[model samples]
Target: QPSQESNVKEIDVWAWDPSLKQIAADYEKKTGIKVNLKNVGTNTKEYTQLDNAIEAGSGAPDVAQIEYYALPQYAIKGNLLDITDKTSGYEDFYNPGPWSSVQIDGKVYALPIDAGPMAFFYNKEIFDKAGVDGEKIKTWDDYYEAAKKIHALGDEYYITSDSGDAGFFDSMTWLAGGKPFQTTNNGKDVTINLTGDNGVKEFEKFWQKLLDEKLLDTKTVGWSEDWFKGMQDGTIASLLTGAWMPGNLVNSAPAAAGKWRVALMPTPNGEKANAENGGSSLAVLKSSPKAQAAYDFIEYVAHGDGVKTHVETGAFPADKASLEADYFKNATTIKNSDGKEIDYFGGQKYNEVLAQASADVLTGYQFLPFEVKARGVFGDYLGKSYTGNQPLSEGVAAWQKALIDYGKEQGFTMKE
Candidate 1:
């Protein structure tokens, strides 16, 4: 490991929110280590800012928060500090897949904070109004049927998304029994598989279902505050997302209190709740002057009883022990409406559910070097079908062609 910096003065850190600020202060009081956390502008800015700072070899925050999925992209570039030997007992603590992500080419880079357990976050009031049973949407076909009913009752949409944003496609493609990529040449070769049958079929099915059923918000075109507004105003019936959503939705749409419930995603035809969506992991920087301290902070925040505190504050900790905390067990602490707890879905033995998801995930597929780029090809074309501007088959072909071109540009030999 790089030589440890002098008894670290102030540890420069970058995070997106104030949630960790108090925790940092608490750490300071206990360890005499002052954490100067500078809020990086946004997740987008932080992504580039952290890498740019490290590239400059100056102004680099001692520790930076990176999403688990994006960690490998950074790891491939050799910019991250290798903390493998440092985090000896970490694997025993976290579920296997999350910890494994930190290890690339046989070196661990960072620690984990949260895991994304996904489900359909539906508006209870809307479901009741539209006569759609929240428990009835057991699979994708059921969801389509319910969405059609929701639209027939009124012109409102079921979900809000955009064509350009392909990450959702990535999530759904995986859920529909497809892998994003697979390793080859000992991890050196990233074989893109967007052109594969499953990828095409999943996108086609999703495109046809939403538009035909009128289940998608036609106006909320992208990932904007407006999309959440749709949820706030009951313009959309459901949000296909991960666990952190409830915490965000409850605060943002306080007027809609007790109007939401969680349901499993519809399986492709006859599958069970095999849906997978958003999740994240935290890793400490190897170059951090206070690596041990950073690890301690992560352990306390992510795995210890303190996770309950974080959960109460909105972040869903992936630690199993935290799920059984008094807050979750009581269920009364988090009320949606009439003594219902939609406090957070990822809490409450979420790790157990995540363990099941991970089994399919690790073997499922590897992420392409630019899986984000490849997914855009299909997702955007599918959107054209929603707007009635193009035929579904024509749009699908355009999407597949886009993925193929994207693969070639990314230097992949096989566009699977």
Candidate 2:
């Protein structure tokens, strides 16, 4: 283990968010401790590096950013410092969705930096044109009806793009209470039943209906150039995704400014709805000697002025106080692609919707440690199904089988 001596005032931090470098600079100024911010891109590269460092028993950064889905992988390997005692008092400081993922068996391993709670974003003009009631869209059936109405408007527009989004599918499955993949015994025992789980089957059937009706744009992958053009040209009327999407929309589909509006995600039974797609957390490595300093820096960035830096960098904050910050609650001008200042979201405080969405996220939804593997197999098969290379039902079954085989290959006792 690295020395825990108080004399060590300098700590190295790894983060993909460039905004964190400035926040680290501010942290350095606040305390006399020097902070070396290493810009590690948020990809498999960072995880590989961390795992290699842990195996070598040294040279790991004091702190690093880990996504909510991947946090369990590190935690289960005993590579993360358990900050349960340090984080106990700040339970209510974070949004529940992000907060839930940072802990395992009541031990906190990370501080949430941002959350990506799901919401329904639609084109108001398209809804008006189709005579669809956006406010009345409370259930999945209602959304289906709206999709039909929008399609009947004699335009090339669709409700949303699918293009085999495993992340979005995971979020929808979460909302439906589907625990398709789970692990126990430090990931030695795994469960893989994507098609067998009732809730997951229901979600699959729902999307399958849309696919049959051609109400979904299965060709354009989200966050791609074609997807951006689809959003700009009104070929895609709405998106069911996380709070982080609005900032992306402003940058990628600027011409569709005032047309967009936000709504609660349609519920399964019309009670309440919530899901989480993507977000990241800050974790202290067990190898770090300066654990206390790392925790302090994480707390400050997650709960203090560092949130402002996140907002400026186009990321939604996980902190409750940051959600209510004046910048989020009030309209601010931003430069569009045309080099002109415009009030994005039509001068509306979009964060208000996001805050509520964050609070409504399902409490018990958790990710399997090998979510990356599951998603890859699932996404590949889902794409084939969407492209008519296989039957949708067969694709789902294949996805389930692939996970089971992969888990067994990884030395896990698989439960189908």
Candidate 3:
């Protein structure tokens, strides 16, 4: 085991967010402890490197950023430091969605940085031009009517794009309570089912209906250059995604500034609810000798002024105070494609809707302990439902089957 000493002058940290470099630089000036920022990779690549280091029993950074979905994978092995005792009264500091993710079986493992609460975004100009009353879209059926009219405007127009992103499907499934994953027998057994009446089927069938009607645009990849162009040209008229989307839109498709509007995600039942798509937490490695400094630095990042720096960098905060603060409510720094600046959402306090959405996220929705594997194989199976002519029901079934088989082969007894 590595020394648990707190005397180290520098502690290694791994994070893909470049904004952290500046935050660390400033922290070094005040604290006199150098935080060495190491970038092995971001997301999947970063996880691979950490896992390599973990298996080798050395070379892991003192702290690393892990998304909420992947945290359980490490925690199940007891590879991460259990900060339950370290984090007293920290629950009140974060939004519930992210807070829930950082905990596993009443044990806290990480500190949330930002939360992705699902919200609906629409283009007013496109809605008006298509003669679609977006205000009337209070239900999923109403959304389809608006979608038909928007697409009827021209071949280029689409309400949204789908390319079979697993995160996207899982986000939708989370809200539908179609929890297709469960672990029983103290993690000795796993169940993967998608054909049931849960929200997963709702997601599959709804998208299948849109696919049948030719309402969804499968050609454009989300966050791609073409994705920005689609939004800029008003071809992609709406987005049903996490609150983090507004910042990306404001920065990428500036021409659409002041043309967008935010709303609660309309559902089949029209009852307000939400799901998380993306969010992350910083975890201290168990082998870190500088655990105290690392923990203090982690707190400094999320609980101190560094969080404000992140917000300036287009980060949606997991900090509850920041989420409800005037800064979050009134922030409007945007430069459009034409060199004009504006409040990307037409001066709307869009965060209000998003804050409520965060509060409405379903309880007891947990990811698989092997979520990294599930996500890795996601695009291969579930992705086809979004991009190809295959029905979503078939795609989901295959994906579920693959998971069950994989789990059984890995020594876990499979249920259905």
Candidate 4:
């Protein structure tokens, strides 16, 4: 149904990123439509505020920023306005990976603004010291061999760290073509198959071997003090994560510049891998009386000059036009903290690698309506496995049990 033209001239927006306030201010100037951007500061706080407002049935923001994984939970509860009509002609305007997340059951719930396509980052000095072949690691088996060599260098180093992050595991599973969880039957039923094909089992088998042999540093979680220090000091030689990581590396390990390089992620069979670790979209609340204006603001931020502004803040663009803009392709050298023009990744423009990775990202990995809960359940048991409290295979079974139990508790039919 087409939303009625709103008489309201002002709309409220909730977002975690403070930089978005400028985008809203710019939109206000352009369209003469006032946007009140509230910085909630964290995903947890933002979601809590939105959920509380939703439950109260009033006082919710007209627009909000929602992660791709959690969008379905809101959409299924009818809290989000269906903007299919508003976003009809712009289907090809975004990269396929992030674009796929905004859609569910043939309807559009949000507009993709940024993406998190996966890639591999390696420390050149560490790899050279360990005599590990970075570029030659085309398959997971090759990656395993490389990890073995790097692990042998000393007790202080390893290939990468996996602290049982569901997002990291999900991205790897996605790239390997695994569809372990899905919500179907109009969100009344969910499918859970953690050990199924499309490489989930294959990845588990390979990862188990790596863990058993102590070839991976699974002790440190991402964003922790240990992880950052490891990255800076070459204790963790290589990392695999989203396209947004290079900027993070710049900030977290400034001294490691000119020593890091990016490559396509090692795959199951040496084929091209396309996967995403994180991304977000703009959503309009159903409680808003200004749905039309909210959608217009979303479109403006998603495709307009706001895209360029947002990408400048270390985010990878989901906008195809923004990704193709000359600014991304023309920047050959990154200005370092010392004001020197340094090639961060030897000679390649970091943006080009991110652009290609975003473009090649595989789509159609559906999210369950209870994804947050699912992730929590999976993470809890998986953490136990990482600490050697139980085997990974047993953890998988425990994770499945928790998912099924939660589904039953929530009144959804569970299926294997």
Candidate 5:
């Protein structure tokens, strides 16, 4: 099972998030392997460089935690290990549908490590004072209505993420029954589907409303440290982000303990609005000399007892064993930055709910590599629109044009 159980295999991994680093260390200890983790950059820069290393054959990391969106782009060139049925717990670890996001042409390419099931984390005291169901609000209209009251009652911004941070926008799109991309034959031909009528209708609704209401913090971007700070002071009443955010919330604002709760994010319209927001996958490179050892290591951290350790540390575990574990159903102890005890989410029971939600997650199509390139262009277009230097239409048109150009260069299809 452990592939001869010889000397440890030293492996390299790429990640910029602290959660990923912790998982790597746990995997190494479980399998007697050495995992060298490198944090190259935060957003697009990291993916761009990692992709380059793999494509250029510069001895890329043996295991990499990649954005779920980028899996398709990397899968196309055979840069990552196929890993189909390679890991024992791959099938049993998480929700079947969300796990399928990493599949290409019926082959399991990557194993999900963590998923971003979204919820609205809000100030419990503020909501209780205003007579609202911070816990029961289920529709976008319900959230918007509550936001109006909350904003009126409180002297701060209601809730907002940077308009230019398209992932925030994409979450809602998937919630409203749209995929981020269109793929044929299971990712054989990845196409940019962001401009679909559903996309446009939804995008215009969110951004235009934010503009008209002057609700957005024009200064906030996704990866900025300020994003975390914004939650600290409660300058924002609620955050419409992934479930990983609760872990962040507790770490960022320890004093506000026991005053926050998570509820389903109001969809673009109805109850059917639901989608997996954010997540990452751990993949074993096919080139590893210790492939079986690597799989054993993966099974330990991803499916074995490491999940209990993960949940104990206030981290979310994507594997199935931990989700069904008894610890998940009751509140457990989590240490804050100051190392004080704090209760987390009535025992992390939401994990199973999140796993089930993953079954219906609409990944659309896994993004091609050029999509990262397109986002670089997309950010600039957003800046232009923000300052009124260019009309919003012009900015989107420019983004489409640039994406088309990049697609042609990369031999990718650009959906009109």
Candidate 6:
């Protein structure tokens, strides 16, 4: 099963992030191996191409930037290379959370590129103005209380906004330990329990209260024009998201550069825990001929000087050494429209908070192989419940049922 290419001097790649191209350029300069990259820009589009090539048994890239959620989808079908033996002794450089994700039943499928560890990104000016202390708010109870105070300030103000982003809900459930979709027996049996210890009921009850209490803006979706305006104009007080948010704020809400700051996700039990909202890995296709050559480039991105380049270019580090490096602790992430680097978190080194959160992330959290489909339907349930003028519980039940139906239809043994 060894796939050694006749010419390993050049390899093809498919990726969206511009930083990877820069890293590829750097790798080429040092190793003299060309990483010919295609910036496809969308995961679904890239996946379609990959799937077609995979089905046709030809014409796939040597490596692709696969999201953690989608990695399993491709991996479960054996479309990804088993780099387990090839990646020998390369595990020490990464943190536990992302390193844990690249494996499927103890076998390696990819090298981690960046992490999206969840954090409580709050507007300091808004919190200070509303007399809410971000640090003093540790538990979910404290967070609810803070939301109450912040919303009481004005009709337009709210702690956060969510108009049914499936990923957002899933990310929240991740921190809450929701087990809405649990797959077992090599994806044969799936457990779909919504209100049990899996964490969905707790989140629905807690988050539904936010919607019912009118403490969250039920109309605006984050990353939209309205959300950006809300962030810039001090209407949205805080956002719970991955540490990869600084770039969005920097580009979308420039005037609010000095307003935002980060804190750890508020715990339900007053115990610190976090989850990944987004992250990606560089995986070589199983069909690739130049596996070692692709690995060298992958190492440069995940383990070597590519870490420095990635960090400098504003991607969150999944590498332990990069996160722990003394210089990294002092680094600031936000820059204003004028290109002057500022501690957009009001003079706080944001990465320090996120790095700790990365470690605090509970490890048992897993994304289902059919995550893309599940995410597609979660929004509809939310629309009816959170925004469609129905009880949030209705949305929760509908969401669970949809997944149960979908899972069974996909030939998995669905369990209640």
* lDDT by residue (tens digit), candidate 4, 200-273: 78778778888888888888888998898999898999998988787677767777878898878888888776
lDDT tens digits, residue span 287-335, model 6: 8889778777887888778888898777888887888777677767565
lDDT of 3: 0.82
> Candidate 1: what lDDT?
0.61
Worst 10-residue lDDT window for candidate 6 reads: 333-342
Q: What is the lDDT of residue 89 in candidate 5?
A: 56
Q: Against the true structure, what is each candidate's TM-score? A: 0.80, 0.93, 0.92, 0.94, 0.82, 0.94
- Can you write out model 2's per-residue Cα lDDT over 1-416, one digit (the tens) per residue? 45786786788888887778788888888888898888766656788888788889877999999889888778877788998888767888888888888877567999998889998888888888899877689999999999999888765889888888778888998888777766666556777777788768878788888888888888898788998898887788899998888767877788898888888899877866588988999999987888888888888788777778777666788878777878765644454545566666666667777888888887777777677667767777777878874656678788888877876776679898
lDDT of 5 by residue, 1-416 (tens): 11333575576666665665677777776666787878878656777777677667666666666767677667766666677756555566566535766776667767766667666667776676666777677766676677666666655555555546656655666667655456565444655555554755575565666655655566666656776666556655667777677666667666566666666666665554466667777666665656666656555655666656656665555555655667764445456767775765444444544544444455443455555566556677767655454545556666666776776677655565
Query: Between 1 and 4, whose TM-score is larger?
Result: 4
Per-residue lDDT for 192-290 in model 1, tens only?
A: 545555754675566566766556776575547787687778777787766556656655666666566666655667564343345555566655667
Better of 2 and 6 by TM-score: 6
Instruction: Give residue 266's lDDT in candidate 6 (0 to 100).
Output: 95
In the predicted model 6, the residue pairs found to clash are 178-198, 179-198, 260-345
For every candidate in turn, the CA RMSD to the true structure comes to 4.6, 2.2, 2.4, 2.1, 4.1, 2.0
Q: What tens-digit string does per-residue lDDT give for candidate 3 at 66-92?
A: 999999778766778888898899878
Candidate 3 regions exceeding 4 Å error are 184-186, 335-341
Higher-TM-score candidate of 3 and 6: 6
Arranged by lDDT with the best first, the candidates are 3, 4, 6, 2, 5, 1
| Over 4 Å off, model 2 | 185-188, 332-341, 389-391
Which structure is stronger by lDDT: 3 or 5?
Answer: 3
TM-score, prediction 6 = 0.94
TM-score of 2: 0.93
The model with the greater TM-score, 4 or 5, is 4
Judge candidate 2 against the unseen true structure and give its global Cα lDDT, from 0 to 1.
Answer: 0.81
Instruction: List candidate 4 stretches off by more than 4 Å.
Output: 1-6, 333-343
Clashing pairs in 3: 178-199
